[PDB]
């Protein structure tokens, strides 16, 4: 919230029309449409079926950030017991598959710990959070210089 | 050194990029500033910082780096 606010107040300042912020910011559709949607058009065209440009990295990192964030949701929503039972069927399958039978693990495969998954999920969530917004922030501001 | 002579008309360069996955259109698009190859532009503000406090030449920067390398050691 604070950085959205800082950025949208400044990008409309730099562009020479603070009134875009003064009017569209009093309701939330304004933020979604006139801040996020309006300012995404150069970023998501950093590459398209017609070529690419220097905004290509940020377009790719922008989606990368969405992907890491969403992967975090897996560790946050599905919890351990589901995955421990699944891994067991893979332990079985591995010890019953010829040729692969020859190879053996030195560390028994186990689902992550309860706490571990909260952390791994949090880290994915935070990492994608930051990479998504930084890609947007930099591309939207540098694609026009405010 | 070009930034300090025209600080409002030069995108400051962070570092060179050397990525063998690039296609030719990516090599062209990222070739910016006065550079001879693909580069990243710096959004850290170190050019304005270093310029404001007195740094002017690439040499100025080199001996600064060496001194910090000594401090690291």
């Amino acid at each position: 919230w604070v950085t959205f606010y800082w950025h949208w107040k400044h990008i409309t300042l730099w562009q020479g029309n603070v009134s875009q912020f003064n009017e569209s910011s009093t309701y939330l559709m304004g933020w979604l449409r006139d801040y996020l949607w309006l300012n995404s058009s150069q970023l998501i065209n950093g590459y398209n079926p017609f070529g690419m440009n220097s905004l290509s990295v940020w377009a790719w990192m922008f989606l990368f950030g969405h992907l890491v964030w969403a992967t975090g949701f897996m560790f946050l929503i599905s919890w351990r017991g589901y995955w421990q039972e699944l891994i067991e069927t893979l332990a079985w399958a591995h010890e019953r598959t010829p040729l692969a039978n020859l190879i053996r693990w030195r560390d028994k495969p186990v689902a992550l710990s309860i706490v571990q998954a909260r952390l791994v999920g949090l880290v994915h969530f935070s990492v994608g959070y930051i990479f998504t917004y930084a890609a947007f922030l930099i591309a939207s501001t540098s694609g026009k210089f405010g | 050194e070009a930034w300090v002579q025209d600080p409002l008309h030069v995108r400051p360069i962070a570092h060179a990029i050397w990525d063998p996955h690039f296609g030719q259109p990516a090599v062209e698009a990222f070739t910016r500033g006065g550079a001879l190859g693909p580069v990243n532009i710096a959004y850290s503000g170190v050019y304005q910082w270093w310029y404001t406090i007195g740094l002017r030449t690439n040499e100025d920067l080199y001996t600064g780096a060496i001194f910090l390398l000594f401090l690291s050691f």
Binding site: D107 | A16, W18, D19, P20, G37
Partner: peptide
């Protein structure tokens, strides 16, 4: 280009492989 073509594959392919192989043997040792 004469140095990036040397250090980029060194730090991005050789060092991680040497590091991953080193750590694999320390963590697996008994």
């Amino acid at each position: 280009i004469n140095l990036p073509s040397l250090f980029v594959p060194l730090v991005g392919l050789l060092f991680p492989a040497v590091a991953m192989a080193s750590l694999f043997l320390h963590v697996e040792k008994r």
